Amino acid sequence: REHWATRLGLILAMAGNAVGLCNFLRFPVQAAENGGGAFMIPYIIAFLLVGIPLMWIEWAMGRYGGAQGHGTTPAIFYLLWRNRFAKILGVFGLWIPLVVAIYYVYIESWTLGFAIKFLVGLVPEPPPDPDSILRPFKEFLYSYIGVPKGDEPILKPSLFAYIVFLITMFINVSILIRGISKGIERFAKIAMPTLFILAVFLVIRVFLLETPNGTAADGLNFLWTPDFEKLKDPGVWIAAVGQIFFTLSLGFGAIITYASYVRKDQDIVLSGLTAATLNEKAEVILGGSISIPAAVAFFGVANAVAIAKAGAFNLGFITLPAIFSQTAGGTFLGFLWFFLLFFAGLTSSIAIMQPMIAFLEDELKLSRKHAVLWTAAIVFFSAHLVMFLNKSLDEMDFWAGTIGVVFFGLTELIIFFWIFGADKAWEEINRGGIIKVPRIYYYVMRYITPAFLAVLLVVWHWTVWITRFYIIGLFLFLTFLVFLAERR
Ligand SMILES: CC(C)C[C@H](N)C(=O)O
Ligand code: NA
Ligand code: NA
Numbered sequence: 001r002e003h004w005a006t007r008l009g010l011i012l013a014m015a016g017n018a019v020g021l022c023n024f025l026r027f028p029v030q031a032a033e034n035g036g037g038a039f040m041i042p043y044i045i046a047f048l049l050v051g052i053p054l055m056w057i058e059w060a061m062g063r064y065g066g067a068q069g070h071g072t073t074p075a076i077f078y079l080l081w082r083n084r085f086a087k088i089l090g091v092f093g094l095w096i097p098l099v100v101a102i103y104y105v106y107i108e109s110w111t112l113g114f115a116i117k118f119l120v121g122l123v124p125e126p127p128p129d130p131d132s133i134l135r136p137f138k139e140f141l142y143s144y145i146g147v148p149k150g151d152e153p154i155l156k157p158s159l160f161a162y163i164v165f166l167i168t169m170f171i172n173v174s175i176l177i178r179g180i181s182k183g184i185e186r187f188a189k190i191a192m193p194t195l196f197i198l199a200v201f202l203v204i205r206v207f208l209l210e211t212p213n214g215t216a217a218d219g220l221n222f223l224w225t226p227d228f229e230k231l232k233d234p235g236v237w238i239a240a241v242g243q244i245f246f247t248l249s250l251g252f253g254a255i256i257t258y259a260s261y262v263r264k265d266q267d268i269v270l271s272g273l274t275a276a277t278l279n280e281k282a283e284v285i286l287g288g289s290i291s292i293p294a295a296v297a298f299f300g301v302a303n304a305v306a307i308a309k310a311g312a313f314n315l316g317f318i319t320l321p322a323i324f325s326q327t328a329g330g331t332f333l334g335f336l337w338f339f340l341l342f343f344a345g346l347t348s349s350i351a352i353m354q355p356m357i358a359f360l361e362d363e364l365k366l367s368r369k370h371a372v373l374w375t376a377a378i379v380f381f382s383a384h385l386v387m388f389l390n391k392s393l394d395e396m397d398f399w400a401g402t403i404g405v406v407f408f409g410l411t412e413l414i415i416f417f418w419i420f421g422a423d424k425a426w427e428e429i430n431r432g433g434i435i436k437v438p439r440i441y442y443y444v445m446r447y448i449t450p451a452f453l454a455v456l457l458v459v460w461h462w463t464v465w466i467t468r469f470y471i472i473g474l475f476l477f478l479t480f481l482v483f484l485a486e487r488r
């Protein structure tokens with residue numbers, strides 16, 4: 001079984017797992033929609049009551065499974081809970097990452113194509129009224145992905161977009177087929193410093209922005225001024241816990257698969273804490289200080305919130321490049337932004353496609369080459385439904401990327417800390433750690449986190465069926481594979 005070569009390499013690979021498109025695309029939108037600073041206070045709390053404990057739990061479950069040669073949740077749930085329903089629940093740990101990747105890699109291909117076109121300078125040229133500049137870029141995006149012009153929910157991606165998607169899939173395959181250390185870790189050691197440097201440069205350049213409508217400091221103040229009145233609103237807590245799940249890759253089965261290659265005796269407490277802290281630094285500091293500060297600097301706080309309500313794609317692929325186009329060297333700055341997004345999306349897509357590869361390797365005894373190639377074939381085939389059927393991405397992100405991840409985090413917490421045991425799980429978490437988990441977190445993992453998640457869950461066109469029917473089929477397919485494994 002493969003193992004990580006260096007501890008720093010493991011930290012950077014886990015950071016690349018956590019640091020992705022969400023940090024720079026969803027967190028600005030979710031923070032601006034929930035009142036700026038009024039969203040930051042619960043988010044941090046959700047990081048302390050939900051994020052870190054589930055991170056440690058997934059690390060421990062991954063290492064525990066990998067010690068016995070099982071990297072995926074169908075087998076790890078059965079190890080922690082000897083029951084067929086445990087395998088059925090673990091099938092979600094393969095279904096969620098695959099379905100998520102099916103469109104995540106397409107968005108990553110978007111970022112790659114935009115980076116290419118901005119480096120070559122094949123960008124729209126607006127004339128010297130905000131709509132006068134936003135419309136050329138908007139249409140620029142609409143021609144790339146093929147937004148429907150009429151009532152039919154049919155997408156028509158450009159040939160360049162399809163070729164760039166092929167290239168993105170090829171890059172993911174070239175990274176994954178080389179293995180854990182020689183592929184994921186080696187690429188992480190290069191991509192993470194690049195990501196941080198690009199994010200820091202963009203943060204500085206955006207902080208240097210100022211128009212008669214405001215400054216980037218105004219956006220930073222809007223994002224960092226606490227509003228204790230909105231602590232009463234449950235929707236802020238819903239958004240905060242959901243964003244924590246999305247940014248820390250919790251409930252996607254990826255952290256478990258990555259930790260399954262950590263050796264039996266290696267540390268998981270300090271390592272996972274450092275990885276989560278790096279991701280939080282990148283998203284909260286760097287990711288949050290690019291889009292929203294520039295939007296506030298060019299339009300003010302109210303118009304920036306109104307633009308953020310339009311969606312993550314509209315802010316990341318239309319509004320920010322249009323804003324950059326009004327500054328000296330703005331095309332190159334947009335190229336830097338899209339290259340940052342592409343490296344983030346790549347370091348996340350390899351991580352969310354690794355679970356299926358690990359399942360095929362451990363449970364069906366497929367070689368790494370065959371496993372990577374078959375996973376790539378499945379993802380590339382299924383991605384056409386997202387590429388051509390409108391709102392299929394929305395359905396996949398709702399069922400697998402939103403409901404599925406939260407329910408799966410709750411399920412893994414219940415299986416590890418209630419079914420498998422509380423003292424056993426705690427000792428497995430703290431075994432071999434450079435530092436020890438604070439004792440209070442025990443009562444956070446056993447009582448506070450599941451009750452929090454349950455309370456928040458409780459308080460929380462026909463073509464959609466086309467997507468649903470498909471992804472359900474995928475689940476069945478995966479189940480059949482599990483069945484075959486059990487018969488082998
Ligand atoms: C699906 C996950 C890889 C997403 C990742 N946590 C991100 O920030 O984009
Ligand atoms: Na993240
Ligand atoms: Na990443």
